[PDB]
Design a protein around this ligand. Structure first.
Ligand SMILES: [Mg+2]
Ligand SMILES: [Mg+2]
Ligand SMILES: [Mg+2]
Ligand SMILES: [Mg+2]
Ligand SMILES: [Mg+2]
Ligand SMILES: [Mg+2]
Ligand SMILES: [Mg+2]
Ligand SMILES: [Mg+2]
Ligand SMILES: [Mg+2]
Ligand SMILES: [Mg+2]
Lengths: 158, 201, 87
RNA sequence: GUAAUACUCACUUUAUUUAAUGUAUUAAAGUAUAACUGCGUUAAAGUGUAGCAUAAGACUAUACAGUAAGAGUGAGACCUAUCAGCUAGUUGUUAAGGUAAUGGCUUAACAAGGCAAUGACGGGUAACGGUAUUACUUUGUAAUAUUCCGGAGAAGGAGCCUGAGAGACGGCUACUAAGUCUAAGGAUUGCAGCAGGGGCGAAACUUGACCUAUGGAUUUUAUCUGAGGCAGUUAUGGGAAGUAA
């Protein structure tokens, strides 16, 4: 269906290329699975020689880590704020790797810092994903603190 | 059409023939729907009947899940109605018939739910005896209340022989405990070496 | 290799002209076996290990045995008995 | 079919997967369908409804060796100027998806790069690459379907299931070119496998016996084996010899 071969592309000089064999099963691809937000759902895959893969169609209640106090706690996922490569994913609410989100601060026990205090009055905090959702099958990430919060907030919608 | 009927409580099945003027009553009825036997004949008064299968004039069977009057050709797989497999994972096309009953139905398979007034001389009268017994000892002991666990002997004392399967499941259950005996003593031998290995160093 | 009948034992190594030979040996040599270490590291739960050429694993050996030294396998208790260093 | 991505040689894979093998570590009552019995169907090819039908089975995880395979870098290889400019996912940066895995392999955003008289880009081949092996030679040329290693295809194209490993064709689905059976409703075929027939040509053999020896199928002493042996037809060639003393 979808191949990853290299025999079809042009040469370094720009001349055309010619094929001599059919499509092999060794280089075999799949379509994109866009992980949405909703009620949870996980389907299984079969890879080469056993080795089962997990893909997540609709994800909820991802895990996150507090960097200062060094504890890990679960939270809900509300909205997406920024996506690096394509800016259309923010209106469709798809979660991929390295895309910042907005999480509930209910179970989280935060320390007293100047920056997080004003958002902690409301329910929301910020986090950034660090795991492949479509292949591992679950999201994990870090909570934004310090100058890392200064970098992303210049890129927000405003 | 000629109807096929069977008795689930008696184990007898028989065939019968319909007049033509009762055949138009049975049109547009999905497989799996009950109907009263009064509209078919006067002989079948008080009878409750249910449709469960049928064949075509060319021999093609009728499916359950397709909901059409005419012929269809789907890609069947293992276990469906119409295709009996001979290899593994090998699926192919066939030709089946839809669920609803029209003028091209040739025979019908009909179950008996509730007996009417009159008894059938060949269907409802005689009973056919059962033929096979379970091999599992736990349900074999429930029908014949014997506590001393002489399954073949007390059946010979009751005397058609039945061969139980309690010997087979006992064999691998003995072999499963056989591994745990030899595996556990292995953990003692390396620990006696380990404490001895740390005495010098 | 040996036959249980007739008490015949042989050691297998090459001759002189790159061919396989079989040399009859004694019962005092019939016990043991020689091999050569290729790799050594510490496995799970802090247990040392030494890996030979054929793929046997051995633990809790003498710390004076290095990566390239040879061992002497008893072949009946499957325990490392003697070693010869590399120099 | 492919003028090089295929092949040969020298390197890398900390960027990857491996059923059957070897040595080790770990863990441990309930629930279907067959064969069977019994009622049937159609020209054929195949298929259906019952007997709460009834059996054996199914609901541990990893290391390191060992075989097998995938993916990269560089160098070599026919004729043509009456073929001198060529290339736009083309060259690069950032980010993501996907694969067992590196990578414009695919997609967003930005930029203008990349190759050439040391022959780019085109055209032709009556072109499968090396090699064991033959000739002719004073630094080496020419042939190499033929023994062995490697690659590609099963009328032409595309797509996929099972599986450790197939884009498989003595496995399945569709279209195109050729068909065959019928009670006219439908059903069905791939001899570049061994014999054999037809066509084409100047041009090439028995519709034969068998597991004796070498091997393969998860222990191969009795199962299978047109793989592989043993015989018949032919001035394809090379030897040891005859037709007298
Ligand atoms: Mg049944
Ligand atoms: Mg683009
Ligand atoms: Mg050649
Ligand atoms: Mg042909
Ligand atoms: Mg093949
Ligand atoms: Mg092939
Ligand atoms: Mg094919
Ligand atoms: Mg064939
Ligand atoms: Mg032939
Ligand atoms: Mg000839």
């Amino acid at each position: 269906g979808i191949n990853h071969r290299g025999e079809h592309k042009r040469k370094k000089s720009g001349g055309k290329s010619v094929l001599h064999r059919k499509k092999r099963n060794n280089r075999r691809g799949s379509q994109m699975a866009a992980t949405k937000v909703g009620s949870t759902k996980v389907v299984e895959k079969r890879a080469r020689g056993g080795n089962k893969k997990y893909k997540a169609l609709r994800l909820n209640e991802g895990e996150f880590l507090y960097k200062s106090g060094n504890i890990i706690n679960s939270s809900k996922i509300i909205e997406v704020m920024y996506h690096p490569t394509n800016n259309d994913y923010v209106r469709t609410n798809t979660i991929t790797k390295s895309s910042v989100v907005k999480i509930s601060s209910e179970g989280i026990k935060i320390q007293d810092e100047e920056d997080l205090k004003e958002m902690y009055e409301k329910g929301y905090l910020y986090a950034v994903i660090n795991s492949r959702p479509g292949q591992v099958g679950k999201a994990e990430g870090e909570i934004l603190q310090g100058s890392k919060l200064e970098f992303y907030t210049n890129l927000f919608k405003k | 059409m000629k109807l096929n009927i069977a008795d689930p409580v008696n184990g007898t099945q028989k065939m019968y023939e319909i007049e033509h003027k009762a055949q138009l009553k049975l049109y547009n009825k999905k497989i799996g729907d009950q109907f009263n036997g009064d509209i078919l004949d006067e002989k079948f008064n008080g009878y409750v009947f249910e449709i469960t299968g049928g064949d075509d004039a060319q021999g093609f069977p009728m499916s359950k899940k397709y909901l059409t009057p005419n012929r269809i050709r789907p890609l069947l797989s293992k276990g469906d109605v119409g295709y009996r497999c001979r290899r593994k994972g090998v699926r192919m096309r066939k030709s089946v018939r839809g669920a609803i009953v029209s003028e091209e139905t040739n025979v019908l398979a009909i179950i008996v739910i509730k007996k009417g007034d009159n008894e059938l001389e060949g269907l409802t009268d005689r009973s056919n005896p059962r033929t096979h017994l379970p091999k599992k000892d736990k349900k074999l002991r429930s029908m014949f209340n014997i506590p001393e666990g002489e399954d073949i002997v007390t059946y010979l004392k009751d005397l058609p022989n039945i061969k139980p399967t309690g010997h087979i499941h006992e064999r691998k259950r003995a072999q499963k405990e056989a591994s745990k005996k030899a595996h556990a003593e292995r953990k003692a031998r390396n620990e006696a070496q380990r404490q001895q290995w740390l005495k010098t160093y | 290799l040996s036959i249980i009948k007739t008490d015949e034992h042989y050691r297998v190594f090459y001759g002189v002209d790159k061919n396989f030979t079989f040399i009859k040996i004694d019962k005092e040599e019939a016990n043991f076996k020689l091999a050569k270490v290729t790799n050594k590291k510490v496995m799970y739960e802090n247990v040392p290990y030494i890996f030979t050429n054929d793929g046997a694993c051995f633990k809790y050996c003498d710390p004076a045995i290095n990566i390239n030294d040879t061992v002497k396998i008893d072949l009946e208790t499957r325990l490392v008995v003697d070693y010869v260093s590399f120099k």
